[PDB]
Each structure stands twice: as C-alpha cells, then as structure tokens.
Write a protein that binds this ligand. Structure first.
Ligand code: ZN
Ligand code: ZN
Ligand code: ZN
Lengths: 133, 66, 157, 176, 167, 85, 37, 54, 309, 39
RNA sequence: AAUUAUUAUUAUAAAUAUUAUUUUAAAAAUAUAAAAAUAUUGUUAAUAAAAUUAUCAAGUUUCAAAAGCGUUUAUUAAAUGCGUCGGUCUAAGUAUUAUAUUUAAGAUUAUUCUUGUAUAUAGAUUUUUAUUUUAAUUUUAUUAGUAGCAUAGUAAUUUAUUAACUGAUUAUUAAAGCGUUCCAUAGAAAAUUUUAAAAUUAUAAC
C-alpha cells in the first residue's frame, strides 16, 4: 500500500525519541549519520542472511544459495560475506525475489511469512557440508 | 528508485497523493516500453517499491552506473 | 441488421485503466471531480509542433509546442532567463580605446541609436543599394524625389 | 482498443469499419501501386526534398541531380519525433563528423529485437528437418535391416510368403 | 415499379460477364474460362513435362554466393514462369540477400527490378527516393523456395499438349 | 504423382498414409539413397466412392500426360517385348 | 467483456480506503515575501 | 523451455506440502520441463551488447 | 506555355486547377516555413463542438474537421513583401487545401521566403523593380499613394505596416476609387464595400492569382473532396424535434417560417455587423444592389459615409 | 468529462443560483456532502 | 464472455513432429441429405444472390422504374457528399473566402401571384413585401400523369397470357403531382422470353 498512514509516522517517533515526552533532536542531528537509527545501523547492522542447506549439503556445489532480506542489494551481499564470514571469492551473484511462504494455520487465518530474496552466489572453489550417519 | 535519506540522490518513489496514481501503475501495470520488452513489472509477483535496495546512482552509457 | 457476430470485438483489448485510482485521488485531496471549472480541452502533442518554424518568437521552441496553435506566435520575447540586463559596467572592447570612447561615451543611448539609424540608412542606399537596385521613388521624369529611403523600407531591410 | 501509439511498430493488419464490408486483410498491392507509380503521394520527406530551395537559391538553378539521401549531419536538430518530417529515416546526427550511429530510439531497438527473433525462428525450423532427417532417415536405414533379417530368416524357414500354394501357381504369372 | 431501386449489389459473382473477368491469364494453355476462378490459380502445378528442379550451378542473384542445392528453404527461388536467363531456372536469392541492392532495405510488396544482375527495389530502381519502410527494414516478407511464387506461372497444360487425345 | 530432388515415381495413396502425402521420404533411383519426394499431382483414388464407377475422380488431364510419356510412345522398344513374356 | 476482475481490482478497492497523510499546508505568500521585510 | 506465454495444467504445477505428500515442486517432478533461461536469452532476447552505441 | 492556369479535368467533372510551372511536390515542403498544429476541430473551451457565441469574430465553425491533416503540405506565407528590393520568382508552388498559389521569391537580399503570387507572373524573372513609370509593374509591391485610379491591386494591407489582409484569395483584386479625402485612398474591396485605406499602406500590384477558381474547380470524387474536409451538414428538418424546432412531420416538411441554425440565421436577418471601423465608408449592404461599375464612378469623401448605420 | 451542474454564470456576475435559491436541505447528516460555503 | 464453454486474443515471426480427449448394434419425426428416370415452375406471397464438388459450381436477353458509391437500430428515393443559389461576414484568417442554410450532381429547363415571419422603418406597437423565408386553396403555363399521388378501380383503351386484380404502350380534366420539374439510367426490385444442379407441383422415393 503506497498511501502514507498518519499513525505510522507517530509510531515511528515514539521509538525514535520519546515522542510526547522527550523533545525532538534538532533537525541537523536528524540529517546526520550520527542519528541513532543511522548510528545503530552503521555499527550494529540487523540482517538475516540465512543459508539454504539443501543446495550446500553433501553434494558439492559452486553455487551455494542464500536468502537475504529484500533490501540487500548484490554488492552488499558481497560486502557482507566478505567482512563477516571471510568469504573472499564471489564473482557473480544471482538474485530473485520470492513471495514469502503462505499457509493456513490450524485455526484458519492465512499466516503468510515475511518475504525474502534468494541470492544464488557463485563461489569460485566449490563448498560442501558433510553429514555423518 | 527508492533512496536513502542521507543520499542526495532523488528517486521517483513518491507517496504524495498526487503521485500514488502512477506508483501503482508501475507495480500492477508495469511499463510496456516501445522497444517491445516489458519493463519494471513483467510477470506475477508485483514489486514492493519500499523494499527495494536504495538507488545508488544514475546510469551511464559507457559503464552501467556512475 | 440481425446478426451481431461479436467476434469483431475482442481484438486488441484496451488497457485496464484502473479508474479507482483517479476516483481515489479525488478523495485523497480536497477537490471533487474537477467540475467544469476545467472540464477540459485536448492538450497539444510534441509531434505536431514544428520547432525551427521561423515563427515562435525564437525564444520559445520548447515552451511553445504547448500553449495552442492560436497563441504561440504571440508568446513574447523575454530573455534566456540567464541573460542579465545590459549592465552599465566598465568593460570597454579590447581595442576600441579612448578618444573614441571619450567621444562615443559622450553620446547617450538615444544620441547613439539616432546616429546609428542615419548611418545604416546611409550604409544601405549607398554602396549596398546604388551598387544595383534603387531605394527611393522617382518622379515624372524619373528623378529620385526623396534624398534617402523612407524609414519603413530600412526597417524591414 | 490498445491505441496504436502503444505498439512498438504500428500494427501490420489495420482493421477498419464498414458494416457492409467483411474482409480481414487490408488490400495491399493497391496501396503499393499508388506510391510507387505516383511520386507526389508520399510527403517529400523534407530533407531529400529540401536541399532544393537551398540549391536553387545559392546556385541560381534547379538541382537537376539525384539529391543525397541520409540527411546531412546537423539538419532537424530541434525536432524530436521526426519520422514524418523526414522519411521514416533516423534523426540525422549532431553537426559532427563522427561515424554515423543510429540514435537508439525505442523503435530501432525493437527492430534489433526482430532480426534476432527472425534468426531465432528460422533456426528452430532449420534444425527440425535436420533431426527429422535423422529419425526418418535412420528409421529407413534400420527398417532395411528388418527386411534383411526377415529376408534371411524367410529362406531357411522356407515361408515363401506368397499364399497357401506352391510356386507352381506363381510360375504361370496369371492370377493363378 | 418494384420499389427498392437502390439495392445491395446482389448479383455480381453470378454473371457470365463476371465469369470472364474472374479468370487469371496464367502461363498455361487452358484456353480461357477454364482456369480456376475463386482462388485465381490451381493448387499443385503439375510439371511432368519439365521436372522443375533447382539446378546445381545455382547462385544468389543479389549476393552471388552458391546456394544450398535443395536440402533447405533458406533460398527464395523465384522461377519467373519459364525464366532460363537468370539461371537454368529463375532468379535465386538466399532469404537474407532478398533486399533492394541500391537502397538496402526490403523490397516492399516483393516486386523487384533486376538492375544489371543485382535486384534493385522498384521505387529506387524507378527513381523515387522514399527510402525507409515501416514494418521490417532489412528483410522482406517473402516466402521461401518458390512457395510464394506458385500462385502464378506454368500450370499443367503449358503448350498445345494434344498428345493426350491423339492416338 | 511424386517427384524428388530430381526425379519422379508414382503411387496411389490410401487413407492410412494421408500424413506422408504432401512430402514423402523414398529411395530416389536417380541416386542411391532415400530422398524426400513431393506431390506433383493426383492420380486417382485408393478405393471407390459410393455409387460411382471404377474411375470416380479420374486421374487427371495432367497425370495422364505423364503416363503418355512413360508408356505412351514406347515405339523405341516394342522390340524385346510388347506385352508378352 | 469488461477487463481486470482479478485480484488487483480486489485490492485497489480495499487498500485505497486508507486515509493518506494530512498536513495543513497553508497558502504561500508568493508576491509578499515576509522575510524580506 | 523459452520465456513464452503458455498454458499449464494445475496438477503439473505441483501442490503445497500436503498431509499426505511433501511439497512437490513443479521441477523435481518434471525435470526436463524446467525453462532454461540461458537458452532463452542466448536465442530470443536482444543483448545490451549488440546495440551499445556511444 | 498555354494559359498559365488550366482546368486540368482528370474526370469530365473533376476539374482541379493545374498550372504549368507548378513546382513538383518534392520542391514544396520547406523546413523553416512549415507549421503544424491540431486545429481544435470545432471544439471550443470545454471541447463541446460549437460555433462562436453570437457576438464575436473568432471562428470555430460547428461544421469543421481535419483542418490540419498531418502530412499535408503546409508552408507558411509572408503577406509582408518588402517595398522596392527586387524579387526573383524561383518556383510556383500550388497547395490544394489552401487554394492559394504561392511562389518562392529570393528578394535579392537573401530571403528565400515570399509567397503571394500575382496573376500573369512567370518564374525565374525579377519582379519588384520598377519600369520607367512610378511603380506600374505586375508583382511590384506599391504603396497606395503610387497607384492611380482604376487599376487593380491585391493583398492590400488594412493598417499600414500591419501586413496584407485584404484581397488575398485567388484572382481577387481591390480596385482604387479616386477619393477626395486628404491623405486617404478608397478601395473597392471585392465585397463591393468601399473602405478609406490609408495611402501609405502597401499593396501588391496586379490581380491576385490562379484565376479560374471562381468556378471550374469541382471535385466530385470521394477521395478528392479531402481538399476541403468538413463535418456532415445535416438537414435542419430531420433533427429529432426534441432537439431542433424544425423536425419530424411525417414526410417532407418544408421548414419553419424563420430559419435558424440553433439560435437564428433567418435568411437575410442575422446580419452580424456589430462594430464598424472608422475607415468603413459603405458596407456590403449599402452597395449590394447597385452594380460593380456605378460604385467606381463617384468620388468618395467623408460626406459619403452615411452618419447613421 | 465533468459537470458543475450550476451552469457557468456570466463572467461579471460569477454566482447565480446558490442551492438555497431552491429551498434545498443539505444537512451534513441528511445527504452527507451538503453544507454550503456561503456560510 | 457466471464455466475447463462458441472461442486460433493475429503484437509478431515461421513452414515436413507419424505434439494427440469424444460413449454406442435399429425404424419415427427432425438437423439433414449421398443417390437417382421423367417433368421444368402446375408448387408458391413469390423458382433462379443462395454450402462444398476435380463431373473444377458462372444463366443469357429485352423493356419499364431508379441515384451514387459513402452511410445508418427495425436499412431505405433515410441522412451524407461536389457543383450552382441564398444569406452573413472586411478590427481574427483569404468576400472567386470562410462561416449558415435550402437543395441535390449530369442533361433540358426552371412558369403565374401574394394577406403573414424577416428586412428597411420615422418614440413602438399599427402600418409597409427589390432580394431571402414561407405561401398560391383556380397558382398550374413547361413537363411527365393511375404514378410509393387521399377515394373512385383491377382507371378506359391496346398489346402479353389458353385465362392479364399482372406489367408495358397510346392519350390525359391528375378528388388538390407540377417546375426542382423532366429526361437520360447501372450491379436493385418488378414484368416478359428463355435456359437451369439444388428432392420446385406431379413424387412418394433412409
Ligand atoms: Zn543470397
Ligand atoms: Zn532500394
Ligand atoms: Zn532424385
């Protein structure tokens, strides 16, 4: 829904700064990378790059598949694996966008999970996982 | 092209009441370019302009993006 | 006609047009349907224009594909919108020099426009006209009644 | 009904009207004879038919020669959708001397998208018969193995394959 | 005075003045009034008199590169009735060499003008100058391997051919 | 009633092989290989039409002139036989 | 033969009831700029 | 195979994870019907490369 | 050349005016002279195809359509020739829809732009130069002072220096009338109404052009009537009596007494002169019945203008 | 396409026919969109 | 299009895939017709523009009435359309022009006379007819006339048919056609003559 709702702004303030009680931070600070949600981001990112194992299991793969939040572009997924998981060999990333899984819970409401973003990275030297039974 | 607050770059994801009539016609209609290929929306799952990664830069002819 | 085959429809279907969106923009704004306050007229298109049309007043060739077919001839000349007024600054041409500047600057900008018109009527009807054509009406015998051309012939020259 | 200005190229078949006229196909071969036969029919396409009015003025003559096609670089620079104030030619160029390049209008790119999907179609057909001329080509080559192995077997087992009778009904070369 | 004197043009394809204006004047003998009428041409021109095969010394008129013998429909074989001069049979063109040589676009409505052994577009070859079409520029709409040219030319009785009823 | 890359043949087609009618695959004897044939013209029917004589459709004025060349003027060779054995 | 009975015509009749943001943008004093006084 | 408008049967589409059967995707039951979008693009679509002019 | 204008007559009725000398279409569309613009059809403010409100002179004739074709030949016209700089008629172009002839003049200081082409003009000749006389040469653009009584002039300008407005149509001519006024010259406009033109006004000497338009131009072909495309002009007496008072009647009703388009156009009633200029001397009504010649006899002064209208 | 229903008055007298001229009832609770402006 | 329905959604391109949804032992009607001697309109309001065909799917002719070829919700002397003509317009468009109409092109001609609207008008009404509008009741001259012509009628004569409520011809006072009349007239709707496959009567004939 593109249409902006009134409440959604108000609910944004009350957590950004205690809205009815604490006066706002001056508009200069809000336009700055030192504003807390821009500071809680530049230093404490919040991302869920979950790895699918069904493609990286006992079968060797050069193309392990991930899921990354819808708003992680390609060159960020590089930066991510590079600086957080030491992965240094990514020549091409291949990115879809998938409607989050949907289903009917036993009650009956259609409980649709959040949506994600398949990003089939392509490492140089293939990777694998062992599973001893 | 959604854009980051700090980024001086300007994107056309407006939500003013005067601009949502065209921002839906991008998400549900999509664009049929006069070259024959359907643009931004061509298939089933309509994009979510507000969950796009931010506009990083204008395109160039020689490379892709400055 | 008793047979409506109704197969001549169905070909090249129209766009969906989602008229709920304009129905919404009305309410998501103070205005009603734009009651005949405008009601409309067909706006022009960029194709039917002809830039470089030797009309257009030469300032507007993109502002003027709109505005009508019956108005853009009159669209006034204004400025490049960056041209600043003629400014009485002190930059004199590189080699015009003083003596000439001291004399010319004495003449004001009606004392110089007047001199220029006389000289130009003198430059035309001079080497330019006496060289081939004639620019002053002649009498019974064919003698040039007036000395120099009449002020209109010069204007449109 | 899907205004023609939307189609990349205006549509090939153009349906009209005429309650009392029922035929899908536009009558070409009549729109062709006029136009080829009559020079005037199609607007001069300014440039190739300008360049007079600019030779006559500067040379005092009729040009009296074939006018160059491909409008000179620098002509029709303010125009945007020329396509009529020209033939369907491209907007000529800048006023430069760089090698001619098609200004990739949305139209030119579409034509590229045809001459690749023409080569695509003629290629999916060209090699159906190339494999069809293996299947049937090799089915026959194999079928003759069958009539050979049947040919060999039908001699030792003596099944003449010519009825209940002996060859003495054949040798007459009657029906019997 | 039957009244509705303005009418529908109800006859017309039910006349004998029509039956003579519907015929085709093709390259056959078929004296007249015996050629086909509605489609204007008979299907399956039988040509047992002369086999009508593609030759071996065959080459593109416009391009001159040798043409695949017969295994393909990449060539537009225009047998202009009995031609002989362009080749043993009629002009030959690969589908992509079928453009106007002088203006280099397609041959609109496929009527070309053989200018000194290089097919020229009729309009350019005629002196006219409108030099770009709308639909497809550098490739004609033509059919391949005579399949578009078999609407005309040399139906079965191409001559007297009275060997039939004579003894 | 069927030709070739360069030659001809003749055959009456049934209902069962109506698919292979337009263009066949066959051993072209003016060659030694199977080569695709075409359908230069009709030469009759494979059976009777109801209430009609033996030659209901009739071969053609055309396929007859093909026959009158094959059998036709054999006067080059009534020698070596005429119809006998 | 209408068109578009599908879901996009089933949302665009339900999500557009969402009341857009309102801000009383009061009239701009163009000709009488107040801060240049 | 190619990115063409087409009509699929619904069982062919494969069902959600049912109580009786796992999620049977349209691929793992019909492998040779997975579209090959390399083979599409290589053949059917116009590459930026072929018209890059500047 | 025989008769620089011909009634070419392709079909025995279809008579279009070909002129030998007419430039071929190729040498017609000139770039910086070609204007294009949708013409509004008859739609005026709020679409609403409609004429003009009774009192106004801005025409949106109800029955108008396809005024600017879009790939029809449309070059703009000068209407302001310059006084005595020689011309040079380069070609003579003939546009059917704007029935006017118009030929391209070089005008001797490079200006390949001038159009209105006076009758008996030949191409590739110099025109604006005077002979021994004052300026009595066909094509010479003459101030109204330089003309004498009784000789035709065309493209007369109504207000001096404001471009030629009167007598632009083919074969037309404003005849001088030898008035008595101090600094004004009365011209017998073709509408048989005389007008005190300022003598300093500029007119082009001669007839106008393309004689044999007055008649002898008759299309009578469905394709060829696209020189003048206009909307259908329905009967006013088959118009759904709810709509138009003349209507119905079970047969051919002749029509109502007082004819009316939608408001009124009774046959000679609606005369719609509302403002007469200070120059006007006798409107077309004051002369409609006399003759062409008797109006050429008198001398015209301010006392001839009738104090009441 | 639209209609004011009032009919454009002369450019000099911009308002003829207020809806009150007809004894109209336009309570906000009666027909909804009612309440006039000249008020 | 209420559907997994009549249903190639024709923007394109291409041309040999052994691509793959249709119950079943009967005669009535009926949808329907392969086949087949005579007869050729006697059927009927009226035969003839009436599916496909390898037996290759086409009636010819005369007369009378009838314009343009476009265009229409009960589909045409409907309404368009060119020309001529009437009126209007020289401070928004070129008075051999564009508005606003009436007609209809082509070819002959376009008659007699005015009580009202309009114009002009003079404080207004009331008065008032250069042109225009509408009118002519004995306008009725030209012209065609039993005609889409208020009844009278199947008009009276002539043909034509074995039989002429047909149709055409002559003239001719037509209940009150009439100069925008009349002629000329092509595919239409009639009337003949004539030929002819639809299973037209006879006639029933899977
Ligand atoms: Zn070739
Ligand atoms: Zn060419
Ligand atoms: Zn062979």
């Amino acid at each position: 829904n593109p249409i902006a709702g009134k409440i959604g702004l108000v609910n944004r303030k009350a957590e950004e700064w205690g809205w009815p009680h604490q006066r706002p931070p001056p508009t200069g600070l809000r336009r700055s990378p030192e504003y807390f949600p821009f500071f809680f981001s530049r230093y404490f990112p919040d991302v869920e790059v979950r790895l699918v194992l069904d493609s990286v299991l006992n079968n060797e793969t050069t193309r392990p598949i991930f899921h990354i939040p819808q708003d992680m572009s390609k060159q960020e997924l590089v930066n991510y694996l590079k600086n957080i998981y030491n992965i240094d060999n990514v020549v091409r990333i291949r990115v879809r966008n998938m409607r989050g899984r949907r289903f009917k819970n036993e009650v009956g409401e259609i409980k649709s999970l959040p949506d994600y973003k398949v990003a089939v990275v392509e490492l140089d030297s293939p990777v694998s996982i062992v599973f001893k039974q | 092209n959604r854009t980051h607050p700090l980024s001086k770059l300007r994107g056309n994801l407006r939500r003013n009441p005067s601009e949502i009539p065209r921002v839906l016609n991008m998400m549900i209609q999509g664009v049929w370019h006069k070259s024959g290929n359907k643009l931004y929306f061509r298939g089933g799952k309509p994009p979510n302009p507000s969950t796009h990664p931010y506009l990083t830069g204008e395109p160039c002819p020689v490379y892709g993006w400055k | 006609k008793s047979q409506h085959k109704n197969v001549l429809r169905k070909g090249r279907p129209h766009m969906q047009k989602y008229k709920e969106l304009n129905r919404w923009q009305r309410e998501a704004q103070g205005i009603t349907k734009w009651e005949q306050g405008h009601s409309h007229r067909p706006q022009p298109y960029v194709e039917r224009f002809n830039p470089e049309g030797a009309g257009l007043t030469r300032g507007t060739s993109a502002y003027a594909w709109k505005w009508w077919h019956t108005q853009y001839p009159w669209l006034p000349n204004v400025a490049p919108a960056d041209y600043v007024p003629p400014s009485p600054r002190g930059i004199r041409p590189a080699a015009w020099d003083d003596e000439f500047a001291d004399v010319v600057l004495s003449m004001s900008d009606e004392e110089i426009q007047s001199y220029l018109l006389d000289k130009l009527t003198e430059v035309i009807f001079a080497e330019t006209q006496r060289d081939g054509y004639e620019l002053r009406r002649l009498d019974f015998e064919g003698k040039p009644l007036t000395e120099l051309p009449e002020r209109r012939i010069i204007e449109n020259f | 009904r899907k205004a023609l200005q939307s189609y990349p190229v205006p549509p090939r078949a153009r349906n009209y009207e005429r309650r009392w006229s029922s035929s899908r196909t536009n009558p070409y071969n009549r729109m062709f004879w006029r136009t080829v036969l009559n020079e005037d029919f199609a607007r001069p396409s300014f440039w190739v038919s300008d360049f007079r009015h600019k030779y006559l003025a500067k040379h005092g003559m009729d040009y009296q020669g074939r006018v160059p096609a491909s409008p000179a670089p620098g002509m029709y620079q303010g125009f945007s959708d020329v396509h009529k104030i020209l033939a369907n030619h491209p907007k000529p160029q800048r006023e430069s001397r760089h090698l001619p390049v098609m200004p990739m209008t949305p139209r030119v790119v579409f034509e590229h998208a045809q001459e690749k999907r023409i080569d695509y179609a003629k290629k999916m057909h060209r090699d159906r018969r190339l494999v069809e001329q293996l299947r049937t080509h090799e089915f026959w080559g194999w079928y003759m193995k069958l009539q050979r192995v049947r040919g060999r077997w039908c001699k030792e087992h003596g099944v003449s394959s010519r009825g209940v009778y002996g060859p003495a009904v054949d040798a007459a070369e009657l029906w019997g | 005075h039957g009244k509705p004197a303005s009418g529908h043009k109800v006859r017309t394809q039910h006349s004998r003045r029509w039956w003579m204006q519907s015929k085709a004047h093709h390259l056959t003998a078929v004296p007249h009034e015996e050629a086909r009428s509605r489609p204007h041409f008979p299907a399956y021109t039988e040509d047992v008199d002369q086999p009508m095969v593609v030759p071996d010394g065959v080459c593109c008129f416009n391009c001159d590169k040798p043409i695949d013998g017969d295994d393909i429909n990449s060539y537009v074989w225009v047998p202009s009735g009995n031609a002989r001069v362009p080749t043993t049979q009629g002009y030959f063109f690969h589908v992509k060499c079928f453009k106007c040589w002088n203006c280099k676009y397609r041959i609109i409505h496929n009527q070309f003008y053989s200018k000194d052994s290089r097919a020229w577009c009729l309009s350019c070859a005629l002196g006219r100058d409108i030099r770009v079409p709308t639909r497809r520029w550098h490739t004609s709409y033509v059919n391949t391997h005579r399949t578009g040219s078999r609407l005309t030319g040399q139906f079965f009785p191409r001559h007297r051919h009275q060997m039939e009823f004579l003894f | 009633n069927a030709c070739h890359v360069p030659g001809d043949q003749i055959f009456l087609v049934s209902n069962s092989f109506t698919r292979r009618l337009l263009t066949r695959t066959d051993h072209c004897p003016k060659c030694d290989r199977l080569s695709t044939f075409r359908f230069m013209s009709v030469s009759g029917m494979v059976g009777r039409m109801p209430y009609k004589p033996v030659d209901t459709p009739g071969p053609s004025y055309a396929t007859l002139y093909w026959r009158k060349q094959r059998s036709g003027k054999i006067a080059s060779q009534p020698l070596n036989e005429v119809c006998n054995k | 033969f209408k068109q578009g009975q599908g879901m996009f015509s089933h949302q665009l009749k339900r999500i557009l009831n969402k009341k857009s943001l309102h801000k009383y943008n009061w009239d701009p004093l163009h000709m009488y700029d107040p801060r240049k006084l | 195979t190619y990115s063409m408008k087409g009509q699929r049967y619904p069982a062919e589409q494969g069902r959600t994870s049912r109580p009786g059967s796992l999620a049977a995707s349209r691929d793992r039951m019909f492998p040779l019907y997975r579209r090959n979008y390399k083979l599409n693009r290589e053949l059917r679509v116009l590459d930026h490369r072929r018209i890059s002019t500047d | 050349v025989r008769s620089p204008d011909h009634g070419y007559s392709q079909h025995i009725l279809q008579k279009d005016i070909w002129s030998p000398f007419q430039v071929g279409a190729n040498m017609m569309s000139y770039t910086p002279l070609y204007y294009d613009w949708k013409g509004f059809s008859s739609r005026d403010y709020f679409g609403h195809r409609s004429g003009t409100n009774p009192g106004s002179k801005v025409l949106l004739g109800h029955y108008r359509r396809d005024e600017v074709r879009s790939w029809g030949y449309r070059i703009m016209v000068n209407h302001k020739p310059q006084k005595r700089i020689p011309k040079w008629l380069a070609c003579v172009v003939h546009i059917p829809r704007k029935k006017t002839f118009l030929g391209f003049f070089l005008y001797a200081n490079g200006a390949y732009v001038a159009e209105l082409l006076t009758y008996k003009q030949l191409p590739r000749i110099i025109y604006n130069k005077a002979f021994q006389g004052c300026l009595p040469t066909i094509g010479q653009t003459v101030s109204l002072t330089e003309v004498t009584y009784g000789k035709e002039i065309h493209s007369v300008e109504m207000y001096p220096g404001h471009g030629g407005v009167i007598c632009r149509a083919s074969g037309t001519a404003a005849v001088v009338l030898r008035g008595s006024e101090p600094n004004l010259v009365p011209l017998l406009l073709p509408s048989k109404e005389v007008r005190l033109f300022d003598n300093m006004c500029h007119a082009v000497f001669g007839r106008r052009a393309g004689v044999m338009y007055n008649k002898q131009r008759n299309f009578s072909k469905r394709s060829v009537e696209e020189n003048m495309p206009h909307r259908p002009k329905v009967h006013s007496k088959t118009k759904r009596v709810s709509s138009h008072p003349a209507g119905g009647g079970n047969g051919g009703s002749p029509n109502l007494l007082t004819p009316l388009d939608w408001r009124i156009h009774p046959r000679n009633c609606v005369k719609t002169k509302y403002w007469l200029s200070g120059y006007i001397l006798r409107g077309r009504q004051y002369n409609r019945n006399q003759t062409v010649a008797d109006l050429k006899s008198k001398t015209y002064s301010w006392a001839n203008r009738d104090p009441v209208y | 396409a639209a209609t004011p229903g009032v009919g454009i008055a002369p450019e000099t007298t911009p308002v003829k026919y207020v809806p009150e001229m007809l004894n109209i009832q336009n309570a906000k609770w009666w027909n909804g969109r009612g309440k006039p402006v000249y008020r």
